[PDB]
Design a protein around this ligand. Structure first.
Ligand SMILES: N=C(N)c1ccc(/N=N\Nc2ccc(C(=N)N)cc2)cc1
Ligand SMILES: [Ca+2]
Length: 223
């Protein structure tokens, strides 16, 4: 997260870190046994780390649970990142508590202008690299689809939206991938992609979760 702020320990209790020996993506807990992340975060041997704040220090609220199953969206296209969404089932149910909480799926889509909370342990620099240890947060509005598609001609699909600040300075970034964009109490976005980070006229691109709620619910119900 570039230009964000320190969330505060466990203030984003649905935020998970996906770990394969190191943090490599965020993900959002959607129930005790399921995380949603970006399909581009897919790897074998994922451990989901819940209750994390400082991802490099055991602070006492963590639950580390291995994934039993990863389900990448049927139509995920890694070239275009269209349908950049994946479900990860945990080997065992997370113990839900105030610091490890699920986030509601949308029942409908969010609108341009809606303010969202984007969070992650991704790079905090737009030039160069600094990875934070504690969770970073960014409040960012959903941008009109037209500004999104103007920003990234030929790359934005109906399964994507832009959020952030065309001015630059405030964005998600590498390492935030897969993490939540939560708007009005619902997971509306997954950190998906962008050009660099917090660059002028290159807002964050986010998987449009509300397109996937049927698939998520059906997939979870069947798995
Ligand atoms: N500007 C953003 N919103 C944004 C930009 C990039 C982004 N990328 N995530 N992850 C990512 C993963 C791997 C590489 C790599 N092969 N070197 C680079 C980036 C996630 C969000
Ligand atoms: Ca920790």
């Amino acid at each position: 997260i570039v230009g964000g702020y320190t969330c505060g320990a466990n203030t984003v209790p649905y935020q998970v870190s996906l770990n394969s020996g190191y943090h490599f993506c965020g993900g959002s807990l959607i129930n005790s046994q399921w995380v949603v992340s970006a399909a581009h975060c897919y790897k074998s041997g994922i451990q989901v780390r819940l209750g994390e704040d400082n991802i490099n220090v055991v602070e006492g609220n963590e639950q580390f649970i291995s994934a039993s199953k990863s389900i990448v969206h049927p139509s995920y296209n890694s070239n275009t990142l269209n349908n950049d969404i994946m479900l990860i089932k945990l080997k065992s149910a997370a113990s839900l508590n105030s610091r490890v909480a699920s986030i509601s799926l949308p029942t409908s889509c969010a609108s341009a202008g809606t303010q969202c909370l984007i969070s992650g342990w991704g790079n905090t620099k737009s030039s160069g690299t600094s990875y934070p240890d504690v969770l970073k947060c960014l409040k960012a509005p959903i941008l009109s689809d037209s500004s999104c598609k103007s920003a990234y001609p030929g790359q934005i699909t109906s399964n994507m939206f832009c959020a952030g600040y065309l001015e630059g300075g405030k964005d998600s970034c590498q390492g935030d991938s897969g993490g939540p964009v939560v708007c009005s109490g619902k997971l509306q976005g997954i950190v998906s992609w962008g050009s660099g980070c917090a660059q002028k006229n290159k807002p964050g691109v986010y998987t449009k979760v509300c397109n996937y709620v049927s698939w998520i619910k059906q997939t979870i119900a069947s798995n």
